[PDB]
Amino acid sequence: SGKRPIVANSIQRRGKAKREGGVGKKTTGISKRRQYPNLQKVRVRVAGQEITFRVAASHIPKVYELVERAKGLRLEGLSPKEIKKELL
Amino acid sequence: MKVILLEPLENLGDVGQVVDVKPGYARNYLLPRGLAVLATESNLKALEARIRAQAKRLAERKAEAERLKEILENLTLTIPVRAGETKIYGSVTAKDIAEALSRQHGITIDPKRLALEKPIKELGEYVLTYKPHPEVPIQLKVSVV
RNA sequence: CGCGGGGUGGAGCAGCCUGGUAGCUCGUCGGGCUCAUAACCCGAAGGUCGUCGGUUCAAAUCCGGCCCCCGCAACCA
RNA sequence: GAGCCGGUAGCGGGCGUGGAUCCCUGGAUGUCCGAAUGGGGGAACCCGGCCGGCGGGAACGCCGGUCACCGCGCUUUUUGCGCGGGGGGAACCUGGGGAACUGAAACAUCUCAGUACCCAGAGGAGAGGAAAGAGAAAUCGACUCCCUGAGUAGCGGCGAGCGAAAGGGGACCAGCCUAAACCGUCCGGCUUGUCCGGGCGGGGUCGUGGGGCCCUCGGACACCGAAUCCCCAGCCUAGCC
RNA sequence: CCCCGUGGUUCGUGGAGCCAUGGGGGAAUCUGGGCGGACCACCGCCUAAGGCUAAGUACUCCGGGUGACCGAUAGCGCACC
RNA sequence: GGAGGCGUAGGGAAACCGAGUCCGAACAGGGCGUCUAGUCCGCGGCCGUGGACCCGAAACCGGGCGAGCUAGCCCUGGCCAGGGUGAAGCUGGGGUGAGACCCAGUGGAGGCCCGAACCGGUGGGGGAUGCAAACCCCUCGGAUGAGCUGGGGCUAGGAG
RNA sequence: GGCGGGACCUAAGGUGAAGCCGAAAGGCGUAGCCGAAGGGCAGCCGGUUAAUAUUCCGGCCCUUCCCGCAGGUGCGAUGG
RNA sequence: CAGGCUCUGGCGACUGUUUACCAAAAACACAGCUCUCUGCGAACUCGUAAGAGGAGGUAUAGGGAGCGACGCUUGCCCGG
RNA sequence: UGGCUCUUGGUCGCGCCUGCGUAGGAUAGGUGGGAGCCUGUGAACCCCCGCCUCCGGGUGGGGGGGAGGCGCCGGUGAAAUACCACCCUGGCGCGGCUGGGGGCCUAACCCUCGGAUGGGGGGACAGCGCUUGGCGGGCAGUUUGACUGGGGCGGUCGCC
RNA sequence: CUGACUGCGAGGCCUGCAAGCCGAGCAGGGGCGAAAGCCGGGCCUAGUGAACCGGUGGUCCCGUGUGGAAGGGCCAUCGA
Ligand SMILES: [Mg+2]
Ligand SMILES: [Mg+2]
Ligand SMILES: [Mg+2]
Ligand SMILES: [Mg+2]
Ligand SMILES: [Mg+2]
Ligand SMILES: [Mg+2]
Ligand SMILES: [Mg+2]
Ligand SMILES: [Mg+2]
Ligand SMILES: [Mg+2]
Ligand SMILES: [Mg+2]
Ligand SMILES: [Mg+2]
Ligand SMILES: [Mg+2]
Ligand SMILES: [Mg+2]
Ligand SMILES: [Mg+2]
Ligand SMILES: [Mg+2]
Ligand SMILES: [Mg+2]
Ligand SMILES: [Mg+2]
Ligand SMILES: [Mg+2]
Ligand SMILES: [Mg+2]
Ligand SMILES: [Mg+2]
Ligand SMILES: [Mg+2]
Ligand SMILES: [Mg+2]
Ligand SMILES: [Mg+2]
Ligand SMILES: [Mg+2]
Ligand SMILES: [Mg+2]
Ligand SMILES: [Mg+2]
Ligand SMILES: [Mg+2]
Ligand SMILES: [Mg+2]
Ligand SMILES: [Mg+2]
Ligand SMILES: [Mg+2]
Ligand SMILES: [Mg+2]
Ligand SMILES: [Mg+2]
Ligand SMILES: [Mg+2]
Ligand SMILES: [Mg+2]
Ligand SMILES: [Mg+2]
Ligand SMILES: [Mg+2]
Ligand SMILES: [Mg+2]
Ligand SMILES: [Mg+2]
Ligand SMILES: [Mg+2]
Ligand SMILES: [Mg+2]
Ligand SMILES: [Mg+2]
Ligand SMILES: [Mg+2]
Ligand SMILES: [Mg+2]
Ligand SMILES: [Mg+2]
Ligand SMILES: [Mg+2]
Ligand SMILES: [Mg+2]
Ligand SMILES: [Mg+2]
Ligand SMILES: [Mg+2]
Ligand SMILES: [Mg+2]
Ligand SMILES: [Mg+2]
Ligand SMILES: [Mg+2]
Ligand SMILES: [Mg+2]
Ligand SMILES: [Mg+2]
Ligand SMILES: [Mg+2]
Ligand SMILES: [Mg+2]
Ligand SMILES: [Mg+2]
Ligand SMILES: [Mg+2]
Ligand SMILES: [Mg+2]
Ligand SMILES: [Mg+2]
Ligand SMILES: [Mg+2]
Ligand SMILES: [Mg+2]
Ligand SMILES: [Mg+2]
Ligand SMILES: [Mg+2]
Ligand SMILES: [Mg+2]
Ligand SMILES: [Mg+2]
Ligand SMILES: [Mg+2]
Ligand SMILES: [Mg+2]
Ligand SMILES: [Mg+2]
Ligand SMILES: [Mg+2]
Ligand SMILES: [Mg+2]
Ligand SMILES: [Mg+2]
Ligand SMILES: [Mg+2]
Ligand SMILES: [Mg+2]
Ligand SMILES: [Mg+2]
Ligand SMILES: [Mg+2]
Ligand SMILES: [Mg+2]
Ligand SMILES: [Mg+2]
Ligand SMILES: [Mg+2]
Ligand SMILES: [Mg+2]
Ligand SMILES: [Mg+2]
Ligand SMILES: [Mg+2]
Ligand SMILES: [Mg+2]
Ligand SMILES: [Mg+2]
Ligand SMILES: [Mg+2]
Ligand SMILES: [Mg+2]
Ligand SMILES: [Mg+2]
Ligand SMILES: [Mg+2]
Ligand SMILES: [Mg+2]
Ligand SMILES: [Mg+2]
Ligand SMILES: [Mg+2]
Ligand SMILES: [Mg+2]
Ligand SMILES: [Mg+2]
Ligand SMILES: [Mg+2]
Ligand SMILES: [Mg+2]
Ligand SMILES: [Mg+2]
Ligand SMILES: [Mg+2]
Ligand SMILES: [Mg+2]
Ligand SMILES: [Mg+2]
Ligand SMILES: [Mg+2]
Ligand SMILES: [Mg+2]
Ligand SMILES: [Mg+2]
Ligand SMILES: [Mg+2]
Ligand SMILES: [Mg+2]
Ligand SMILES: [Mg+2]
Ligand SMILES: [Mg+2]
Ligand SMILES: [Mg+2]
Ligand SMILES: [Mg+2]
Ligand SMILES: [Mg+2]
Ligand SMILES: [Mg+2]
Ligand SMILES: [Mg+2]
Ligand SMILES: [Mg+2]
Ligand SMILES: [Mg+2]
Ligand SMILES: [Mg+2]
Ligand SMILES: [Mg+2]
Ligand SMILES: [Mg+2]
Ligand SMILES: [Mg+2]
Ligand SMILES: [Mg+2]
Ligand SMILES: [Mg+2]
Ligand SMILES: [Mg+2]
Ligand SMILES: [Mg+2]
Ligand SMILES: [Mg+2]
Ligand SMILES: [Mg+2]
Ligand SMILES: [Mg+2]
Ligand SMILES: [Mg+2]
Ligand SMILES: [Mg+2]
Ligand SMILES: [Mg+2]
Ligand SMILES: [Mg+2]
Ligand SMILES: [Mg+2]
Ligand SMILES: [Mg+2]
Ligand SMILES: [Mg+2]
Ligand SMILES: [Mg+2]
Ligand SMILES: [Mg+2]
Ligand SMILES: [Mg+2]
Ligand SMILES: [Mg+2]
Ligand SMILES: [Mg+2]
Ligand SMILES: [Mg+2]
Ligand SMILES: [Mg+2]
Ligand SMILES: [Mg+2]
Ligand SMILES: [Mg+2]
Ligand SMILES: [Mg+2]
Ligand SMILES: [Mg+2]
Ligand SMILES: [Mg+2]
Ligand SMILES: [Mg+2]
Ligand SMILES: [Mg+2]
Ligand SMILES: [Mg+2]
Ligand SMILES: [Mg+2]
Ligand SMILES: [Mg+2]
Ligand SMILES: [Mg+2]
Ligand SMILES: [Mg+2]
Ligand SMILES: [Mg+2]
Ligand SMILES: [Mg+2]
Ligand SMILES: [Mg+2]
Ligand SMILES: [Mg+2]
Ligand SMILES: [Mg+2]
Ligand SMILES: [Mg+2]
Ligand SMILES: [Mg+2]
Ligand SMILES: [Mg+2]
Ligand SMILES: [Mg+2]
Ligand SMILES: [Mg+2]
Ligand SMILES: [Mg+2]
Ligand SMILES: [Mg+2]
Ligand SMILES: [Mg+2]
Ligand SMILES: [Mg+2]
Ligand SMILES: [Mg+2]
Ligand SMILES: [Mg+2]
Ligand SMILES: [Mg+2]
Ligand SMILES: [Mg+2]
Ligand SMILES: [Mg+2]
Ligand SMILES: [Mg+2]
Ligand SMILES: [Mg+2]
Ligand SMILES: [Mg+2]
Ligand SMILES: [Mg+2]
Ligand SMILES: [Mg+2]
Ligand SMILES: [Mg+2]
Ligand SMILES: [Mg+2]
Ligand SMILES: [Mg+2]
Ligand SMILES: [Mg+2]
Ligand SMILES: [Mg+2]
Ligand SMILES: [Mg+2]
Ligand SMILES: [Mg+2]
Ligand SMILES: [Mg+2]
Ligand SMILES: [Mg+2]
Ligand SMILES: [Mg+2]
Ligand SMILES: [Mg+2]
Ligand SMILES: [Mg+2]
Ligand SMILES: [Mg+2]
Ligand SMILES: [Mg+2]
Ligand SMILES: [Mg+2]
Ligand SMILES: [Mg+2]
Ligand SMILES: [Mg+2]
Ligand SMILES: [Mg+2]
Ligand SMILES: [Mg+2]
Ligand SMILES: [Mg+2]
Ligand SMILES: [Mg+2]
Ligand SMILES: [Mg+2]
Ligand SMILES: [Mg+2]
Ligand SMILES: [Mg+2]
Ligand SMILES: [Mg+2]
Ligand SMILES: [Mg+2]
Ligand SMILES: [Mg+2]
Ligand SMILES: [Mg+2]
Ligand SMILES: [Mg+2]
Ligand SMILES: [Mg+2]
Ligand SMILES: [Mg+2]
Ligand SMILES: [Mg+2]
Ligand SMILES: [Mg+2]
Ligand SMILES: [Mg+2]
Ligand SMILES: [Mg+2]
Ligand SMILES: [Mg+2]
Ligand SMILES: [Mg+2]
Ligand SMILES: [Mg+2]
Ligand SMILES: [Mg+2]
Ligand SMILES: [Mg+2]
Ligand SMILES: [Mg+2]
Ligand SMILES: [Mg+2]
Ligand SMILES: [Mg+2]
Ligand SMILES: [Mg+2]
Ligand SMILES: [Mg+2]
Ligand SMILES: [Mg+2]
Ligand SMILES: [Mg+2]
Ligand SMILES: [Mg+2]
Ligand SMILES: [Mg+2]
Ligand SMILES: [Mg+2]
Ligand SMILES: [Mg+2]
Ligand SMILES: [Mg+2]
Ligand SMILES: [Mg+2]
Ligand SMILES: [Mg+2]
Ligand SMILES: [Mg+2]
Ligand SMILES: [Mg+2]
Ligand SMILES: [Mg+2]
Ligand SMILES: [Mg+2]
Ligand SMILES: [Mg+2]
Ligand SMILES: [Mg+2]
Ligand SMILES: [Mg+2]
Ligand SMILES: [Mg+2]
Ligand SMILES: [Mg+2]
Ligand SMILES: [Mg+2]
Ligand SMILES: [Mg+2]
Ligand SMILES: [Mg+2]
Ligand SMILES: [Mg+2]
Ligand SMILES: [Mg+2]
Ligand SMILES: [Mg+2]
Ligand SMILES: [Mg+2]
Ligand SMILES: [Mg+2]
Ligand SMILES: [Mg+2]
Ligand SMILES: [Mg+2]
Ligand SMILES: [Mg+2]
Ligand SMILES: [Mg+2]
Ligand SMILES: [Mg+2]
Ligand SMILES: [Mg+2]
Ligand SMILES: [Mg+2]
Ligand SMILES: [Mg+2]
Ligand SMILES: [Mg+2]
Ligand SMILES: [Mg+2]
Ligand SMILES: [Mg+2]
Ligand SMILES: [Mg+2]
Ligand SMILES: [Mg+2]
Ligand SMILES: [Mg+2]
Ligand SMILES: [Mg+2]
Ligand SMILES: [Mg+2]
Ligand SMILES: [Mg+2]
Ligand SMILES: [Mg+2]
Ligand SMILES: [Mg+2]
Ligand SMILES: [Mg+2]
Ligand SMILES: [Mg+2]
Ligand SMILES: [Mg+2]
Ligand SMILES: [Mg+2]
Ligand SMILES: [Mg+2]
Ligand SMILES: [Mg+2]
Ligand SMILES: [Mg+2]
Ligand SMILES: [Mg+2]
Ligand SMILES: [Mg+2]
Ligand SMILES: [Mg+2]
Ligand SMILES: [Mg+2]
Ligand SMILES: [Mg+2]
Ligand SMILES: [Mg+2]
Ligand SMILES: [Mg+2]
Ligand SMILES: [Mg+2]
Ligand SMILES: [Mg+2]
Ligand SMILES: [Mg+2]
Ligand SMILES: [Mg+2]
Ligand SMILES: [Mg+2]
Ligand SMILES: [Mg+2]
Ligand SMILES: [Mg+2]
Ligand SMILES: [Mg+2]
């Protein structure tokens, strides 16, 4: 999946194997294949409660940057999932 | 990573600093324990504030130091309070040293920022050392009688 | 094709570092010794050290090219 | 404007110039099933909560109302209340996935073809759209569609095949709003600050570069103007001469 | 932005740029930054990483009009319950 | 409606030149080209692209539909006339130092025996436009088991 | 009302709050809910109709529920 | 209604299983032997995944393979 | 994707040291300069210490000691033996860049414990993402010629 | 001594096409020979391979806004 601040699906783009010179020629073999987004979990606190993020490796920082913006935010209310959501 | 730490560590350094560490050390330790903080744009500036605020602050106090430093130098506090022929009937403290000053002129001064251990019980004239700033000492002339 | 490392006694290899050095095993002949092959002991012959050119006082040695076998992957319309 | 109680005659019995049947518009009523939505389930059935009613009526039954889930917003968490989603549609449209036969006179690159089909979503269309454009003219000026450019330029086991764009001719014609600097205010947090952040309001939108703040111009009634709003013409949903 | 893997384009790795982007590294705010088919210089063009926008276009469930269209083995599978 | 197309000039890979031009040192030779044709519409014959005269595969691929037949398992129930044989164990007696062991009685074991239901399908005949798209008669196999059977439910197409 | 099923229970399975997974469609899943030819539950004998009958009738017998009374006791649950 | 018996070979130990509809067997299966993988979030299988089976099992267990009651036995070769 | 620590490599700069056939008196990597060079910018002879070895000498660090010490040519080898310079072969001390190996830790990530903000095991490993090369009928798509007194097998396939 | 030439090539043989073969003479520039003249390999008929893709040398040419460069073309030759 893709899920979080990430915003990245999983693109199906082929991988074609070839045999060759480049200084004599270059020929082929080709098939569809699915490229996945490097993707990790990120646990963080945010007031009370924990809260995980199924984010891509790229935007791991964005998530911390989000908790920083959350300090300026008024939250609580037994909001486990609810925080994440209201957490933009 | 760039991070601004809020705690001295033999590791990285004294508080308020800003040092590069590997993101891990930040993400999974320093940052959440709170020993350090993501040095975002906001924080770097929130640190300007934290500086400028006390920075100009102290200088503006030292201001009111060269203010007293000039008055307190060209002046002697004549302190009339009964006394034997050498010793004093009772005693003069900084508190008194202070009120006499705040009356005999109107200049207010913190009694504590005034070097004097045991109260004066001798009769005579002295010069006690006042200190609102650790780089602005003031020799205060006086005269119990 | 470019990459790598060698052509040393009748057989190879050590010597090629970091120049001042041909020795090893078996083999050939002779001698010693055994019933005897043989083991064993003494001694000797059999190498432009692939080749030519160059450094150096001095090379198998360092360097160029060449002649050849081995190996490396990689290309073949 | 004379008949009428469908197709549908007959048994039986009615209605119409006190203007019926019939046609157009609006409203009413609308069992159960179906997105199906109180809960269940083998659609068209079965069982129940709360409130009010019906019967002698507390047991039973029936009637009226109401009670799924999900998103967004007020609700202080709360529990609420409010607007929205759900499902369907011939073809058309966009997006996420996506073949093989067959062709190459075999076949693997290649072709068929981003077609067939599956999925989600849009709507009377959909997509695209005001230049980080094109490309050689010190030129053009959003997007879309048609003609042409052109079977060109190219791509290609240089095979089989595939196959542009600019430019010109037409249709249509339209441009706009934000983000940020800076200013104001509401709330939170905290190492109370000349701060950090979140929300709301002002401000601002460009490539002759534009915008912000500061100073000078006078800063203006004027000037432009909706793709939102109102009314009207016209038009369609019965007829008439 | 450069690199690795790909997709789009006429472009099948080709001297391969442009648009897009799964992985890695990772800026700047106009003396900025993209592009004009590798690259470099010169000279031009253009301002990315927010959004909306009518008409001209496509379709025929539906109603109407018309035919060198059919006439019941034809014409829609069905003129007909 | 002149955008656009074809035609008016060729030769050369091109740069280029032009009634020429290319090869070449060549005013040798030689290739190709000069001494003009064309286009627009109708019609016909053929060619290319599309299913391209018509009817016919065995196949392949995409999405769906099937385990109410059959196969396996899961859940819960049901069924197996009658007869036979007589294991261990136990009781008792014998036996020995104690015992193994012996005998009798008792007992009721078993993918045990005979054989109906029920589950098969061995050989023969019959049937062969059938009673029947697998039947019929004789015969034969299993029959407390790895048994048979009702109801509920699960697994499927390169999959079960 | 008593037979069978339902206003009872749970089985395999199914479904499916929570939770997890997946390009979409979807896949898995605790509780719970559904799911029976299993558990649970009150009717027998006889008569009668052209045609039904533990269903109508006759005799005899029983269950749950509501209300009231009399008597009795800490009563009380999806929890043990 | 209701066994023809005997002797002697082959195959397969045995009861079972099978080509629904031309093959019931000497074919499969079987108890049993051997090799081998697997230390538990097991190995292996299904699934893109989550997950599930394995097993709520733990090497006297589980997967894979061959041989196939029982008796006697199972030689030499590690170049490919 | 992290904290600590030991250990080791490449490579560059700096610093410093090693590389001993006769010969010349000599155990002088190279080439070139220049007769002069050290010592109070405290020397020779001698005690202590590190490192090398060709077993002699060599070089660096602590003291006694005191104004004395080396070179040159002749000699001599292939070259000259003070001193200064660029550099080589090999190595040591510093920092820069950069990698390989061991150990420990816990907080990522993973497992687990009658909820746990927690505790226990694992641990920067494993899982997963991108990329590398490999093994790979488990699976997929295809290919596997024509002549031919039928096909196959055999023979043949172009040129003189 | 190096005509085992360079630039051509009238005209034919042969032939479905593609290909194969013989060739006078012209220019350049040269070898042998006194000269006439002969020499564009070998007495002759076998000793071979279209196209495409690519390599090395060269060179009037092309070079994506311009100048270069990348690459390509042309000539020569190479890998069946
Ligand atoms: Mg996820
Ligand atoms: Mg991404
Ligand atoms: Mg998605
Ligand atoms: Mg790949
Ligand atoms: Mg190349
Ligand atoms: Mg190719
Ligand atoms: Mg293909
Ligand atoms: Mg394919
Ligand atoms: Mg993490
Ligand atoms: Mg969460
Ligand atoms: Mg990254
Ligand atoms: Mg914030
Ligand atoms: Mg809440
Ligand atoms: Mg809550
Ligand atoms: Mg939400
Ligand atoms: Mg809110
Ligand atoms: Mg990191
Ligand atoms: Mg006094
Ligand atoms: Mg007195
Ligand atoms: Mg006062
Ligand atoms: Mg004051
Ligand atoms: Mg004061
Ligand atoms: Mg100070
Ligand atoms: Mg090598
Ligand atoms: Mg040898
Ligand atoms: Mg040897
Ligand atoms: Mg040796
Ligand atoms: Mg010997
Ligand atoms: Mg010899
Ligand atoms: Mg030799
Ligand atoms: Mg010799
Ligand atoms: Mg050989
Ligand atoms: Mg060999
Ligand atoms: Mg080798
Ligand atoms: Mg009428
Ligand atoms: Mg009527
Ligand atoms: Mg009627
Ligand atoms: Mg009627
Ligand atoms: Mg009538
Ligand atoms: Mg009538
Ligand atoms: Mg009548
Ligand atoms: Mg009428
Ligand atoms: Mg009528
Ligand atoms: Mg109506
Ligand atoms: Mg009503
Ligand atoms: Mg309903
Ligand atoms: Mg409702
Ligand atoms: Mg429902
Ligand atoms: Mg009520
Ligand atoms: Mg009532
Ligand atoms: Mg209603
Ligand atoms: Mg109700
Ligand atoms: Mg929900
Ligand atoms: Mg909701
Ligand atoms: Mg709202
Ligand atoms: Mg809400
Ligand atoms: Mg409200
Ligand atoms: Mg509010
Ligand atoms: Mg709420
Ligand atoms: Mg309230
Ligand atoms: Mg609330
Ligand atoms: Mg509500
Ligand atoms: Mg509610
Ligand atoms: Mg509302
Ligand atoms: Mg809607
Ligand atoms: Mg819709
Ligand atoms: Mg698409
Ligand atoms: Mg897609
Ligand atoms: Mg095929
Ligand atoms: Mg074929
Ligand atoms: Mg295609
Ligand atoms: Mg599509
Ligand atoms: Mg959706
Ligand atoms: Mg829809
Ligand atoms: Mg539109
Ligand atoms: Mg749009
Ligand atoms: Mg704009
Ligand atoms: Mg195509
Ligand atoms: Mg086409
Ligand atoms: Mg076009
Ligand atoms: Mg145009
Ligand atoms: Mg136009
Ligand atoms: Mg028009
Ligand atoms: Mg316009
Ligand atoms: Mg604010
Ligand atoms: Mg907000
Ligand atoms: Mg604002
Ligand atoms: Mg605003
Ligand atoms: Mg505005
Ligand atoms: Mg303005
Ligand atoms: Mg703009
Ligand atoms: Mg400006
Ligand atoms: Mg202003
Ligand atoms: Mg004014
Ligand atoms: Mg103004
Ligand atoms: Mg507007
Ligand atoms: Mg009208
Ligand atoms: Mg009307
Ligand atoms: Mg009238
Ligand atoms: Mg770029
Ligand atoms: Mg990569
Ligand atoms: Mg790669
Ligand atoms: Mg790329
Ligand atoms: Mg694609
Ligand atoms: Mg492509
Ligand atoms: Mg194309
Ligand atoms: Mg392509
Ligand atoms: Mg490309
Ligand atoms: Mg790009
Ligand atoms: Mg990317
Ligand atoms: Mg760009
Ligand atoms: Mg451009
Ligand atoms: Mg360019
Ligand atoms: Mg531009
Ligand atoms: Mg722009
Ligand atoms: Mg921008
Ligand atoms: Mg913009
Ligand atoms: Mg825009
Ligand atoms: Mg945009
Ligand atoms: Mg639009
Ligand atoms: Mg139209
Ligand atoms: Mg019509
Ligand atoms: Mg009509
Ligand atoms: Mg008509
Ligand atoms: Mg007609
Ligand atoms: Mg008919
Ligand atoms: Mg018909
Ligand atoms: Mg007729
Ligand atoms: Mg007919
Ligand atoms: Mg129709
Ligand atoms: Mg019809
Ligand atoms: Mg009908
Ligand atoms: Mg009909
Ligand atoms: Mg031409
Ligand atoms: Mg001529
Ligand atoms: Mg001719
Ligand atoms: Mg001519
Ligand atoms: Mg001619
Ligand atoms: Mg002509
Ligand atoms: Mg014509
Ligand atoms: Mg024609
Ligand atoms: Mg033709
Ligand atoms: Mg054609
Ligand atoms: Mg056909
Ligand atoms: Mg035809
Ligand atoms: Mg045709
Ligand atoms: Mg079945
Ligand atoms: Mg059956
Ligand atoms: Mg029995
Ligand atoms: Mg007995
Ligand atoms: Mg006894
Ligand atoms: Mg006994
Ligand atoms: Mg007895
Ligand atoms: Mg016994
Ligand atoms: Mg006994
Ligand atoms: Mg007995
Ligand atoms: Mg017995
Ligand atoms: Mg008995
Ligand atoms: Mg039996
Ligand atoms: Mg038997
Ligand atoms: Mg029976
Ligand atoms: Mg039977
Ligand atoms: Mg039978
Ligand atoms: Mg039979
Ligand atoms: Mg049979
Ligand atoms: Mg038979
Ligand atoms: Mg028969
Ligand atoms: Mg018959
Ligand atoms: Mg018959
Ligand atoms: Mg029988
Ligand atoms: Mg039997
Ligand atoms: Mg059964
Ligand atoms: Mg059963
Ligand atoms: Mg049933
Ligand atoms: Mg199939
Ligand atoms: Mg299929
Ligand atoms: Mg299979
Ligand atoms: Mg299978
Ligand atoms: Mg009963
Ligand atoms: Mg009942
Ligand atoms: Mg129930
Ligand atoms: Mg039930
Ligand atoms: Mg239940
Ligand atoms: Mg269950
Ligand atoms: Mg789902
Ligand atoms: Mg979903
Ligand atoms: Mg499910
Ligand atoms: Mg159900
Ligand atoms: Mg139930
Ligand atoms: Mg029951
Ligand atoms: Mg029952
Ligand atoms: Mg009873
Ligand atoms: Mg009764
Ligand atoms: Mg009874
Ligand atoms: Mg009856
Ligand atoms: Mg009764
Ligand atoms: Mg009690
Ligand atoms: Mg109590
Ligand atoms: Mg109780
Ligand atoms: Mg009998
Ligand atoms: Mg018998
Ligand atoms: Mg007999
Ligand atoms: Mg027998
Ligand atoms: Mg058998
Ligand atoms: Mg046997
Ligand atoms: Mg049996
Ligand atoms: Mg079976
Ligand atoms: Mg059978
Ligand atoms: Mg059977
Ligand atoms: Mg059959
Ligand atoms: Mg069959
Ligand atoms: Mg049998
Ligand atoms: Mg079988
Ligand atoms: Mg076994
Ligand atoms: Mg055995
Ligand atoms: Mg093991
Ligand atoms: Mg598998
Ligand atoms: Mg798998
Ligand atoms: Mg498990
Ligand atoms: Mg289990
Ligand atoms: Mg085993
Ligand atoms: Mg034996
Ligand atoms: Mg054996
Ligand atoms: Mg033997
Ligand atoms: Mg072997
Ligand atoms: Mg071995
Ligand atoms: Mg071996
Ligand atoms: Mg790693
Ligand atoms: Mg040396
Ligand atoms: Mg020597
Ligand atoms: Mg001498
Ligand atoms: Mg010098
Ligand atoms: Mg000199
Ligand atoms: Mg001199
Ligand atoms: Mg010196
Ligand atoms: Mg000196
Ligand atoms: Mg020493
Ligand atoms: Mg030395
Ligand atoms: Mg000298
Ligand atoms: Mg010297
Ligand atoms: Mg350091
Ligand atoms: Mg280092
Ligand atoms: Mg370093
Ligand atoms: Mg380490
Ligand atoms: Mg450890
Ligand atoms: Mg520990
Ligand atoms: Mg630990
Ligand atoms: Mg701890
Ligand atoms: Mg992690
Ligand atoms: Mg926890
Ligand atoms: Mg934790
Ligand atoms: Mg823990
Ligand atoms: Mg732990
Ligand atoms: Mg540990
Ligand atoms: Mg480890
Ligand atoms: Mg790792
Ligand atoms: Mg292998
Ligand atoms: Mg294999
Ligand atoms: Mg392979
Ligand atoms: Mg293979
Ligand atoms: Mg295959
Ligand atoms: Mg194919
Ligand atoms: Mg082939
Ligand atoms: Mg043939
Ligand atoms: Mg033949
Ligand atoms: Mg014949
Ligand atoms: Mg053959
Ligand atoms: Mg020939
Ligand atoms: Mg000719
Ligand atoms: Mg010819
Ligand atoms: Mg020839
Ligand atoms: Mg010929
Ligand atoms: Mg000859
Ligand atoms: Mg001939
Ligand atoms: Mg080809
Ligand atoms: Mg070429
Ligand atoms: Mg050139
Ligand atoms: Mg030329
Ligand atoms: Mg040029
Ligand atoms: Mg040029
Ligand atoms: Mg261009
Ligand atoms: Mg130009
Ligand atoms: Mg250029
Ligand atoms: Mg070139
Ligand atoms: Mg070239």
Curated annotation (Swiss-Prot), chain A:
Pfam families named in the record: Ribosomal_L28 (PF00830)
Protein's UniProt name: Large ribosomal subunit protein bL28
A GO molecular function held by the record: structural constituent of ribosome
Gene3D superfamilies: 2.20.150.30, 3.30.160.850
A GO biological-process term: translation
Residue stretches in coiled coil: none
Signal peptide: none
Naturally occurring in which organism (per UniProt): Thermus thermophilus (strain ATCC BAA-163 / DSM 7039 / HB27)
Gene Ontology CC annotations of this record: ribonucleoprotein complex; ribosome
Keywords annotated in UniProt: Ribonucleoprotein, Ribosomal protein
UniProt record similarity statement: Belongs to the bacterial ribosomal protein bL28 family.
Keyword Ubl conjugation found: no
Classification via PANTHER family: 50S RIBOSOMAL PROTEIN L28, LARGE RIBOSOMAL SUBUNIT PROTEIN BL28A
Domain of life: Bacteria
Gene assigned in the entry: rpmB
Keyword Ubl conjugation assigned: no
Curated annotation (Swiss-Prot), chain B:
GO biological process entries: translation
SUPFAM superfamilies on file: L9 N-domain-like, Ribosomal protein L9 C-domain
One GO CC term, this protein: ribonucleoprotein complex
Coiled coil: none
Superkingdom of origin: Bacteria
InterPro entries, per database record: Ribosomal_bL9, Ribosomal_bL9/RNase_H1_N, Ribosomal_bL9_bac/chp, Ribosomal_bL9_C, Ribosomal_bL9_C_sf, Ribosomal_bL9_N, Ribosomal_bL9_N_sf
Disulfide bonding pattern of the chain: none
Matching Gene3D superfamilies: Ribosomal protein L9, C-terminal domain (3.10.430.100), Ribosomal protein L9, N-terminal domain (3.40.5.10)
A Pfam family assignment: Ribosomal_L9_N
GO MF terms held by the record: rRNA binding; structural constituent of ribosome
Record flagged with keyword tRNA processing: no
Keyword annotations from UniProtKB, A to Z: Ribonucleoprotein, Ribosomal protein, RNA-binding, rRNA-binding
Zinc is among the record's keywords: no
Function: Binds to the 23S rRNA.
Family membership noted in the UniProt record: Belongs to the bacterial ribosomal protein bL9 family.
NCBIfam families cross-referenced by the UniProt entry: L9
Protein's name according to its UniProt entry: Large ribosomal subunit protein bL9
